[PDB]
């Protein structure tokens, strides 16, 4: 589908973010078009088609709320939706609002440059398209550029190589194979139990163990759903008015104030219920090392009790960082998997990987021969997608250069020096620290409301004020430094990627507080922006 040469708004990306931007700008009477690398809609849910791929937020919360019809018509079937289901949902939405008519697929944005003479962006693609747009919305994701681990010999491996973030579109058959998985984040934890059912032998190459708690998935009772639908807009407002964008209970006590007995009984309740709600069991879990440690120990002990061989069990136990400060993962039959004779936990803290070889993986202790190797090694998060594009602001400043020591933004939404450019649910905003459908919807509404305001008032140039950006950055850093999150190497701090600057990238104050600030900024005529 040939993109238009001129448009009010150009949107990069056709995942949840870009699809809602497209729809809402259409409803606002603006010309808008999307460019997307993928062959079809869905973003993460299009790319991450590995077996076992599944959301870690309840289905009834991980969904769009902008359409009453969608909320009433769609039937989720389980507690946590699988990738195939979520992709059917996204297709449903795209069909319902005729969105593909406004999207060019199989096309990658390669560069974009602001023209101060015209107050427009000129955007290039890898098909030779040149598009001129007044406003540029980067809906290009947070976890959208797969990261390879930092090991030699990958190109020499003679077997089949996969990354979970670029999985094949046809099922992959691992029957009778010796298979390795590198990475035990959410992606490794989900894929490994599925591989284990086909492989002759599965080797799981763990570096730092990640905390994971049971999902306790279950079918969603259609009666509960029908009931929820009679108050769905209300239920969703309840979610928007929280720090996390879900119904998670905000435990009012301190993990230090309670007795050991009360702690165990309260944590046991969360462990049996399943899901990530334990993160908020007590108010200070992410704020006080000793509080955090009480919870962490309870979890570590549950992990130990899951695997019979106590040497294997102990190698599964996360150490050296606070519970919750790498993103909490939900597991289904992952720990149980290691009791199987054909699954092998390779502890690469103890025996670091030296190289990939034609046959497999060599650690400092031995060579593992493999027919296939699956990389669940994560993503170049938050900034990665943007840094693959040659984005140039005023005075030919490269975004990649301005952000070389970390992302610098006002509200996460724009950066000084780069007018008319907006980032959806990225650094400087709650982003992944909230249910992302809540984060995404609020960003899309705020940005598209702003663009509508500009057009209504006959303005053409919107730029974040440098001083306000510097004050925002410092503020993000100061509130993060009251938490334990900067203490740990995670993708939230860029520690994922050799050479990337280590700074915590997200707003930790909660979605609700962030939303209030955004509302106040807009109400005052976009204070901290200069509009002309
Ligand atoms: C496997 C996985 C599971 C997740 N599960 C949850 C969860 O349970 N709960 C939660 O809150 N969040 C979770 N997320 C986080 C997730 O990023 C969001 O929930 C949301 O799906 C992001 O939507 P988005 O549209 O902002 O970005 P994406 O879904 O990443 O879509 C961005 C799109 O932009 C395209 N693109 C990027 N650069 C260019 C370019 N230069 N030119 C053209 N196109 C480009 C990409 O191909 C992609 O299709 C998960 C993420 C992953 C990776
Ligand atoms: N259930 C879901 O909803 C779901 C599923 C998948 C992903 N997600 C989202 O996507 C995010 C990313 O998850 P992920 O599991 O893809 O990535 P990840 O959380 O970034 O984990 C990457 C894994 O790869 C290992 N790794 C990276 N580089 C390595 C190297 N050079 N050598 C050895 N190991 C290496 C890491 O070890 P170290 O920890 O030791 O670095 C870690 O085990 C999640 O946190 C979440 O936001 C959600």
Swiss-Prot record:
Its cofactor is FAD. Optimum pH is 8.0. It is an enzyme of class 1 (oxidoreductase). The record marks 327 as: Transition state stabilizer. The keyword rRNA processing does not apply. GO terms for molecular function: flavin adenine dinucleotide binding; N,N-dimethylaniline monooxygenase activity; NADP binding; phenylacetone monooxygenase activity. FAD binds at residues 17, 36, 44-47, 56, 62, 109, 142, 436. NADP(+) binds at residues 54-56, 184-190, 207-208, 326-327, 491. Thermostable. Displays an activity half-life of 1 day at 52 degrees Celsius. Belongs to the FAD-binding monooxygenase family. This is Phenylacetone monooxygenase. It comes from Thermobifida fusca (strain YX). The lineage of its organism: Bacteria, Bacillati, Actinomycetota, Actinomycetes, Streptosporangiales. The gene is pamO.
């Amino acid at each position: 589908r040939q993109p238009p040469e001129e448009v009010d708004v150009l949107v990069v990306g056709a995942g949840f973010s870009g699809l809602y931007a497209l729809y809402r700008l259409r409803e606002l009477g603006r010309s808008v078009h999307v460019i997307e690398t993928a062959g079809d809609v869905g973003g993460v849910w299009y790319w991450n088609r590995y077996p076992g791929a599944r959301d870690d937020i309840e289905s009834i919360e991980y969904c769009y709320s902008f359409s009453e019809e969608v909320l009433q018509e769609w039937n989720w079937t389980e507690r946590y939706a699988s990738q195939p289901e979520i992709l059917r949902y996204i297709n449903f939405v795209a069909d319902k609002f005729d969105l593909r008519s406004g999207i060019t697929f199989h096309t990658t944005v390669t560069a974009a440059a602001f023209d101060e003479a015209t107050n427009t962006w000129t955007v290039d693609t890898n098909h030779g398209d040149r598009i001129r747009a007044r406003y540029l919305i980067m809906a290009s994701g947070q976890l959208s550029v797969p990261q390879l681990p930092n090991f030699p010999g990958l190109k020499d491996f003679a077997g089949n190589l996969y990354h979970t973030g670029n999985w094949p579109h046809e099922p992959v058959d691992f029957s009778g194979q010796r298979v390795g998985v590198i990475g035990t984040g959410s992606s490794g934890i989900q894929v490994s139990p599925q591989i284990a059912k086909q492989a002759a032998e599965l080797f799981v190459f763990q570096r730092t163990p990640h905390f994971a708690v049971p999902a306790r998935n279950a079918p969603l009772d259609p009666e509960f759903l029908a009931d929820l639908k009679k108050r769905y807009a209300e239920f969703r407002e309840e979610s928007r008015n929280t720090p996390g964008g879900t119904h998670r209970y905000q435990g009012p006590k301190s993990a230090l104030e309670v007795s050991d007995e009360e702690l165990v009984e309260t944590l046991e309740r969360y462990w049996q219920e399943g899901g990530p709600d334990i993160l908020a069991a007590y108010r200070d879990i992410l704020r006080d090392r000793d509080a955090n440690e009480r919870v962490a120990e309870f979890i570590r002990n549950k992990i130990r009790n899951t695997v019979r061989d106590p040497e294997v069990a102990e190698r599964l136990v996360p150490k050296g960082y606070p519970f919750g400060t790498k993103r909490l993962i939900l597991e289904i039959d992952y720990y149980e998997m290691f009791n199987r004779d054909n699954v092998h936990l390779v502890d690469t803290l103890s025996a670091p990987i030296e190289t990939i070889t034609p046959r497999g993986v060599r650690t400092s202790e031995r060579e593992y021969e493999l027919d296939s190797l699956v990389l669940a090694t994560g993503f170049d998060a938050l900034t990665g997608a943007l840094f693959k594009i040659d984005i140039r602001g005023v005075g030919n400043v490269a975004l990649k250069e301005k952000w070389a020591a970390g992302p610098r933004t006002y509200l996460g939404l724009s950066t000084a020096g780069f007018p008319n450019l907006f980032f959806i649910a990225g650094p400087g905003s709650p982003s992944a620290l909230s249910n992302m459908l809540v984060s995404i919807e609020q960003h899309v509404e705020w940005v598209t409301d702003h663009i509508a305001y500009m057009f209504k008032n006959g303005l053409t140039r919107s730029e974040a004020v440098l001083e306000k950006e510097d004050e925002w950055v410092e503020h993000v850093n100061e509130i993060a430094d009251e938490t334990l999150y900067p203490m740990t190497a995670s993708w939230y701090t860029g520690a994922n990627v050799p050479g990337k600057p280590r700074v915590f990238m997200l707003y930790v104050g909660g979605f609700h507080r962030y939303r209030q600030i955004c509302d106040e900024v807009a109400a005052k005529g976009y204070e901290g922006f200069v509009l002309t």
